Design an enzyme around this catalytic site. Sequence first.
Site, PDB file in Angstrom:
ATOM      1  CG  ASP D  82      -2.172   0.691   1.053  1.00  0.00           C
ATOM      2  OD1 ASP D  82      -2.246   1.717   0.277  1.00  0.00           O
ATOM      3  OD2 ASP D  82      -3.263   0.104   1.624  1.00  0.00           O
ATOM      4  CG  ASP D 195      -7.334   3.682  -3.499  1.00  0.00           C
ATOM      5  OD1 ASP D 195      -8.425   3.462  -3.913  1.00  0.00           O
ATOM      6  OD2 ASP D 195      -6.924   3.863  -2.319  1.00  0.00           O
ATOM      7  NE  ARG D 255     -11.598   4.714  -3.949  1.00  0.00           N
ATOM      8  CZ  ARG D 255     -11.057   5.684  -2.748  1.00  0.00           C
ATOM      9  NH1 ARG D 255     -11.001   5.200  -1.648  1.00  0.00           N
ATOM     10  NH2 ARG D 255     -11.273   6.947  -3.120  1.00  0.00           N
ATOM     11  CG  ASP D 271     -11.836   2.667   2.106  1.00  0.00           C
ATOM     12  OD1 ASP D 271     -10.841   1.699   1.905  1.00  0.00           O
ATOM     13  OD2 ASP D 271     -11.434   3.651   2.057  1.00  0.00           O
ATOM     14  CG  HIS D 329      -6.817  -3.706   2.014  1.00  0.00           C
ATOM     15  ND1 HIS D 329      -5.369  -3.405   2.192  1.00  0.00           N
ATOM     16  CD2 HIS D 329      -7.177  -2.485   1.601  1.00  0.00           C
ATOM     17  CE1 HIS D 329      -5.187  -2.189   1.872  1.00  0.00           C
ATOM     18  NE2 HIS D 329      -6.307  -1.563   1.745  1.00  0.00           N
TER      19      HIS D 329
END
Lengths: 105, 82, 152, 597
Positions: D82, D195, D255, D271, D329
């Site tokens: 990440d 992302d 995303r 998320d 994740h």
Amino acid sequence: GAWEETFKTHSDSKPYGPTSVGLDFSLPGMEHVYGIPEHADSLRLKVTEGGEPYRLYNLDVFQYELNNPMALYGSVPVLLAHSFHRDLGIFWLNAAETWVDISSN
Amino acid sequence: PFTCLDGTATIPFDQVNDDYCDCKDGSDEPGTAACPNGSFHCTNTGYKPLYILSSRVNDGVCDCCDGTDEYNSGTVCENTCR
Amino acid sequence: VDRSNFKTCDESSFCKRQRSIRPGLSPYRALLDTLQLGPDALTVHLIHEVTKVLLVLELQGLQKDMTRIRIDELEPRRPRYRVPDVLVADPPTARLSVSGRDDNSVELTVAEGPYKIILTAQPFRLDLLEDRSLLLSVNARGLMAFEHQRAP
Amino acid sequence: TPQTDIRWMSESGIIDVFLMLGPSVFDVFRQYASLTGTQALPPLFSLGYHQSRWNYRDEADVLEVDQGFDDHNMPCDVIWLDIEHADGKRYFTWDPTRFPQPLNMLEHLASKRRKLVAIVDPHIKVDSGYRVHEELRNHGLYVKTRDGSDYEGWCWPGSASYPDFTNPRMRAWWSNMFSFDNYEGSAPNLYVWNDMNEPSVFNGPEVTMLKDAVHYGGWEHRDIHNIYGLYVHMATADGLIQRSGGIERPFVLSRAFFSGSQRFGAVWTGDNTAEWDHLKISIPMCLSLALVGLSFCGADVGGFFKNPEPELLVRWYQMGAYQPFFRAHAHLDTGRREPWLLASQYQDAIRDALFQRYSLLPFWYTLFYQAHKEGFPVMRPLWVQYPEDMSTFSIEDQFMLGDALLIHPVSDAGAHGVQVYLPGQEEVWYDIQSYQKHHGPQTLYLPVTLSSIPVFQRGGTIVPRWMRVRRSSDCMKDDPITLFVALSPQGTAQGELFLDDGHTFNYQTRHEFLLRRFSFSGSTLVSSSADPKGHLETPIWIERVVIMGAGKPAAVVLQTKGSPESRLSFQHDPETSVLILRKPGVSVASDWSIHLR
Ligand SMILES: NNNc1ccc(NCCOCCN[C@H]2C[C@](O)(CO)[C@@H](O)[C@H](O)[C@H]2O)c([N+](=O)[O-])c1
Ligand SMILES: [Ca+2]
Ligand SMILES: [Ca+2]
């Protein structure tokens, strides 16, 4: 808000003014529609009559909640209608902010 | 013929290391990856021996320092028992 | 749960304008005098009865039993956006034919059937049929709204 | 009389709508796929298990995680890096202290036959020492404001500018940035995660870009917004293809997405939260994405925010093991939850879930090949397979994989059973754990334990498995197949199997692949070619056939082109009507037939 428009503290100079487009579609025999992700909501889409339309606008929503039509990170403007007798699809090829109203009769 | 170490069967010797698992304890395939609960013995000549999972025979990864777990995988393992 | 960060439809000025339009008699109507059957499409002028704004409907029957509806301004001050790179090909078209007509209606056949499109002139409306089964209607609730580009 | 009305309201652009008339839902799939394309065929490794979190510390942490999987006998194909792996969120860089030798780390992972994914976001830190920023600034490739200046917003590295991915010259620049000479420290086993590509702008309206920012051609940001993320996804995937010389298939997770994003890789639902209701909602969210062409969908296993209790983590692995994109994740402030850190009983159920997923890779791969060729979704609502059963039109605690497997994962704490709706008139369903047969339609009460994953195989289907679970899919991709034949009430079954090298475009540019048809009728299992154009050099063979719903034969005979007629030994369980054919030994590229006398 038809031209210059503010939301919270952000200003949209909207130099071209109002330019929105819209159109409705009637699906006789259909009681179940699906699609237009992304929403943290049910597979079978709900009627929007008493509340908000479904929103399609790629947005980063911090700690998003369940069972509501707020626009999430992705937008696919494709709706499927299913009945015992037939299947249909609508593909609304538009890249701007899009709201979708759904009503049953 | 050969009989499993747990007595679950008895098979001709042509079913030992024939790349099919015939014993419940894996004892009929000490040289292959056919049994899920089998073990492969790294001789590691001159050094410490080692047992590895049968699923790591010919997986293309060097598990024994002597390299004998990779004999038909396309990975050539060097001897690193030093 | 503080969602004041994100607009509701009411806080979006174009959503508030459009959603205030409620089901009823549409002010748009097709000008069947302007009808034109081209190689790939049927094109016809639409008009807003009050504002006299002129639009262009481009109607297409497509291979694999699909219909494409595109509406743009006839004389726009500036070009409107058309989404690129999403379609993998220019969709193969099927030929439309006028197979019926009256003073307020034009029936269109996609290739040799069984799919048909009925264009109602006043008020503007589209109906899609397989044989005689109505599959779907367009602007049946009169909610079509097209804000033309004004003086900047 | 019943009718539904749909109204679309858009801020700008033209009206442009496609009406797709079916009549079946698979006609609608084909219709939409002919417009926007089909799911890109994922490289096999990306259908395995991904281990991720925000963030793994350094190279040593990555290698310890890699060793953890092997020390605890759990398979894993990819470990994810990440945003903390870069230098202060300057993408295409590496932190000089914690990732000083990325080539060595990637080489260590390559020796374990595993991959790595690195995050690359489309916001570029405003920093005159950042070469990416200098080049984009000097070549005028940034999104602009009305006064002509480069747009500046706020994101992970602080003040950042946004490349204009609607500009084709910017996308070519981006794609070329992924060459092994430009992206220093990258290697062929390094893939990419895009992302924040909505784009996320922390100090912008609704956390995104101003409507009146200006893009290529003078179009406003309000005109183009919903395809901005798609252009990032597309440019990245093209970059992974170009860096290999056009040979290697990409893997990119994104995303943000739009119609057509299925052509460029996977998406996930962002998320989510370590809560039971977020576990439940992963099914309708990915099902709604499958229906509109995005088959490579998943949700963060265990939840992104907060800490899941061990029971919830177990159920999330079982759920995720049967969803297309399978990645654990977690948020920066969560406790570490690599699956071997739990107590042994939770470890064992999680390992069981991982083994089931790895065993089913041949099946997953074939479903994605069918999605790629036909535009049919991998994960399906029950009503797609039973369009006349109105009691399925709203089901969302259950789903199908293709037409063969019906899945009802446990999604409630302390559950003692689940209610499984088994649909279909004249249909049978086999519990793949107990082999118990069940006739449809019915709602079955199935008792469960911590290790239960309610999965049923449909009568009339043949499911291929790799029963030899190894540490990663690369290790397995030459292994023999076991065929699971579920007999219909008419004594019939059929299935397909796709094979190729697992990662290149050779299936398309050189027709190097196998597409096999397996069919059972009367008392004979037959393998034939479902596509003669495909040829493949492969050691894969048929090591076992498991037939559910069969009686005991007197003898089993195998015939293969080029071989004498052979006799096979077998085992039959009279209680479960399960027949196991021992070691047919035939190449998967060969026509063959097995007759039950
Ligand atoms: N520079 N400003 N400081 C600042 C610091 C902390 C926050 N809290 C936000 C926590 O939400 C994270 C969003 N998650 C993204 C990104 C990833 O977390 C890391 O790439 C990935 O793991 C996720 O999968 C991906 O979805 C904020 N802020 O504005 O919220 C601002
Ligand atoms: Ca044996
Ligand atoms: Ca090995």
